[PDB]
Design an enzyme around this catalytic site. Structure first.
Site, PDB file in Angstrom:
ATOM      1  N   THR A  16       0.828  -1.190   0.000  1.00 32.45           N
ATOM      2  CA  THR A  16       0.000   0.000   0.000  1.00 32.45           C
ATOM      3  C   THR A  16       0.868   1.248   0.000  1.00 32.45           C
ATOM      4  O   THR A  16       0.361   2.349  -0.160  1.00 32.45           O
ATOM      5  CB  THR A  16      -0.957   0.043   1.205  1.00 32.45           C
ATOM      6  OG1 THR A  16      -0.201  -0.065   2.420  1.00 32.45           O
ATOM      7  CG2 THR A  16      -1.935  -1.105   1.137  1.00 32.45           C
ATOM      8  N   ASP A  39       4.296  -8.058 -29.737  1.00 30.44           N
ATOM      9  CA  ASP A  39       5.482  -7.203 -29.621  1.00 30.44           C
ATOM     10  C   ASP A  39       6.567  -7.595 -30.647  1.00 30.44           C
ATOM     11  O   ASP A  39       6.242  -8.011 -31.759  1.00 30.44           O
ATOM     12  CB  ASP A  39       6.015  -7.291 -28.183  1.00 30.44           C
ATOM     13  CG  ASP A  39       6.673  -6.014 -27.716  1.00 30.44           C
ATOM     14  OD1 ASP A  39       6.100  -5.321 -26.849  1.00 30.44           O
ATOM     15  OD2 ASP A  39       7.778  -5.714 -28.192  1.00 30.44           O
ATOM     16  N   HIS A  69      12.795  -5.635 -26.788  1.00 37.36           N
ATOM     17  CA  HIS A  69      11.604  -5.016 -26.197  1.00 37.36           C
ATOM     18  C   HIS A  69      10.563  -6.063 -25.795  1.00 37.36           C
ATOM     19  O   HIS A  69      10.070  -6.059 -24.668  1.00 37.36           O
ATOM     20  CB  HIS A  69      11.017  -4.015 -27.196  1.00 37.36           C
ATOM     21  CG  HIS A  69       9.880  -3.187 -26.671  1.00 37.36           C
ATOM     22  ND1 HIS A  69       8.558  -3.532 -26.862  1.00 37.36           N
ATOM     23  CD2 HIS A  69       9.867  -1.988 -26.037  1.00 37.36           C
ATOM     24  CE1 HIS A  69       7.780  -2.597 -26.343  1.00 37.36           C
ATOM     25  NE2 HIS A  69       8.551  -1.649 -25.835  1.00 37.36           N
ATOM     26  N   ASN A 161       4.104   7.441 -24.527  1.00 38.79           N
ATOM     27  CA  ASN A 161       5.182   8.150 -23.827  1.00 38.79           C
ATOM     28  C   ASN A 161       5.398   9.580 -24.314  1.00 38.79           C
ATOM     29  O   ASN A 161       6.542  10.042 -24.431  1.00 38.79           O
ATOM     30  CB  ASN A 161       6.494   7.371 -23.969  1.00 38.79           C
ATOM     31  CG  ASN A 161       6.352   5.913 -23.577  1.00 38.79           C
ATOM     32  OD1 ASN A 161       5.751   5.585 -22.551  1.00 38.79           O
ATOM     33  ND2 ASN A 161       6.907   5.025 -24.392  1.00 38.79           N
ATOM     34  N   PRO A 175     -11.793   2.958 -25.572  1.00 39.56           N
ATOM     35  CA  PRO A 175     -12.244   2.929 -24.174  1.00 39.56           C
ATOM     36  C   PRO A 175     -12.441   1.522 -23.602  1.00 39.56           C
ATOM     37  O   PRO A 175     -12.288   1.349 -22.392  1.00 39.56           O
ATOM     38  CB  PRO A 175     -13.584   3.679 -24.221  1.00 39.56           C
ATOM     39  CG  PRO A 175     -13.518   4.484 -25.475  1.00 39.56           C
ATOM     40  CD  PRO A 175     -12.740   3.666 -26.448  1.00 39.56           C
ATOM     41  N   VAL A 177     -10.775  -1.235 -23.694  1.00 41.28           N
ATOM     42  CA  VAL A 177      -9.628  -2.014 -23.237  1.00 41.28           C
ATOM     43  C   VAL A 177      -9.068  -1.360 -21.972  1.00 41.28           C
ATOM     44  O   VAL A 177      -9.668  -0.417 -21.441  1.00 41.28           O
ATOM     45  CB  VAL A 177      -8.532  -2.145 -24.330  1.00 41.28           C
ATOM     46  CG1 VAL A 177      -9.112  -2.740 -25.598  1.00 41.28           C
ATOM     47  CG2 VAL A 177      -7.880  -0.794 -24.636  1.00 41.28           C
ATOM     48  N   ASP A 200      -7.094   4.000 -17.487  1.00 40.86           N
ATOM     49  CA  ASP A 200      -7.826   3.198 -16.512  1.00 40.86           C
ATOM     50  C   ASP A 200      -7.060   2.992 -15.221  1.00 40.86           C
ATOM     51  O   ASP A 200      -7.665   2.819 -14.161  1.00 40.86           O
ATOM     52  CB  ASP A 200      -8.164   1.823 -17.095  1.00 40.86           C
ATOM     53  CG  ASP A 200      -9.136   1.908 -18.251  1.00 40.86           C
ATOM     54  OD1 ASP A 200     -10.338   2.123 -17.983  1.00 40.86           O
ATOM     55  OD2 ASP A 200      -8.700   1.767 -19.413  1.00 40.86           O
ATOM     56  N   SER A 224       5.385   1.110 -21.901  1.00 41.60           N
ATOM     57  CA  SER A 224       5.585  -0.267 -22.354  1.00 41.60           C
ATOM     58  C   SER A 224       5.918  -1.197 -21.198  1.00 41.60           C
ATOM     59  O   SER A 224       5.645  -2.388 -21.266  1.00 41.60           O
ATOM     60  CB  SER A 224       6.709  -0.344 -23.392  1.00 41.60           C
ATOM     61  OG  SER A 224       6.289   0.084 -24.671  1.00 41.60           O
ATOM     62  N   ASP A 260      -2.424   7.742  -4.217  1.00 41.04           N
ATOM     63  CA  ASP A 260      -1.011   7.659  -3.846  1.00 41.04           C
ATOM     64  C   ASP A 260      -0.074   8.425  -4.780  1.00 41.04           C
ATOM     65  O   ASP A 260       1.054   8.751  -4.401  1.00 41.04           O
ATOM     66  CB  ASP A 260      -0.557   6.198  -3.813  1.00 41.04           C
ATOM     67  CG  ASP A 260      -0.904   5.496  -2.514  1.00 41.04           C
ATOM     68  OD1 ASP A 260      -0.646   4.274  -2.421  1.00 41.04           O
ATOM     69  OD2 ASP A 260      -1.424   6.157  -1.588  1.00 41.04           O
TER      70      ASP A 260
HETATM   71 CA   LIG Z   1     -10.783   1.568 -20.561  1.00 39.03          CA
HETATM   72 CA   LIG Z   2      -0.886   4.316   0.007  1.00 36.68          CA
END
Ligand SMILES: [Ca+2]
Ligand SMILES: [Ca+2]
Length: 279
Positions: A16, A39, A69, A161, A175, A177, A200, A224, A260
């Site tokens: 956490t 990939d 990669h 990136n 949206p 995925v 997400d 990635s 966080d």
């Molecule tokens: Ca989504």
């Molecule tokens: Ca936390």
């Protein structure tokens, strides 16, 4: 189970709070699930995959990962030392060339291939696809990602990136995925990570140690790298029976560490992937 002196990203998804060094996980470790890594390929012979990886399709002259990669991403999904889901089965689909590049037509073909191929595999706990790639917006690419998800595969894709809104990139902007941003070991948004309302979830993406070609290892950074953390986590949770391919992204968001992260723009979720392990 506990892996001591784990890569920081593994430790982070089982805590956490930032700054811990042990990865806590259930021994089932994704056994019985399957993850397609779409990939540059996978060096299946790497000792770290323990015979659990295989190439199943290539769109180029060879099935070999001549780049690294794909092997790095596969390692974060399911290698022994560097992986989230240490007992999952890995399938490589080479849609990117050894320079890390690929045409959208080939990437789309690779997604449609996985939707069909999964019907020939024994993956009793479910199927995940990890897509650490993308480029400018394309409705065709988004549609292919949507199809793959609809077919019963948990699709995780990199946000990109560009330190920009991911709405202008594909397949990040689809949206349906699971679109993954990157964070660093101090719980900051990675400086390169895309953001926006279509994200997400966040996962560890800066300075991620994993497998590399030539039976080696190295540390690299990107969305990635965050994406396979989430793909591996989904496989792990599916094996535990906590969620399904259709709802895994939602479940991961529901059970995430919330609030966080720092340097999150207003309108972007503040959610960091978390496995909620309790001994
Ligand atoms: Ca989504
Ligand atoms: Ca936390």
């Amino acid at each position: 189970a506990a892996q001591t002196n784990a890569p920081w990203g593994l430790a982070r998804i089982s805590s956490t709070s930032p700054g811990t060094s042990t990865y806590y996980y259930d021994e089932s470790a994704g056994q019985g699930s399957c993850v397609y890594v779409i990939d540059t390929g996978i060096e299946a012979s790497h000792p770290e995959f323990e015979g659990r990886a295989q190439m199943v399709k290539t769109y180029y002259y060879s099935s070999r990962d001549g780049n690294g990669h794909g092997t790095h991403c596969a390692g974060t999904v399911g290698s022994r030392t560097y992986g989230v889901a240490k007992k999952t089965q890995l399938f490589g689909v080479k849609v990117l060339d050894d320079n890390g590049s690929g045409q959208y037509s080939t990437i789309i073909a690779g997604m449609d291939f996985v939707a069909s191929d999964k019907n020939n595999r024994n993956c009793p706990k479910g199927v995940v696809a990890s897509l650490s790639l993308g480029g400018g917006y394309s409705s065709s690419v988004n549609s292919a990602a949507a199809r793959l998800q609809s077919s019963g595969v948990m699709v995780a894709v990199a946000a990109g990136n560009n330190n920009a809104d991911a709405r202008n990139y594909s397949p990040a902007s689809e949206p349906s995925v699971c679109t993954v941003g990157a964070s660093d070991r101090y719980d900051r948004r990675s400086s390169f990570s895309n953001y926006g309302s279509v994200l997400d979830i966040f996962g560890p993406g800066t300075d991620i140690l994993s497998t590399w070609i030539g039976g080696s290892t190295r540390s690299i950074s990107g969305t990635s790298m965050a994406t396979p953390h989430v793909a591996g986590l989904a496989a792990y949770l599916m094996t535990l029976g906590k969620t399904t391919a259709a709802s895994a992204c939602r479940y991961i968001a529901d059970t995430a560490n919330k609030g966080d992260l720092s340097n999150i723009p207003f309108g972007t979720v503040n959610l960091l992937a978390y496995n909620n392990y309790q001994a």
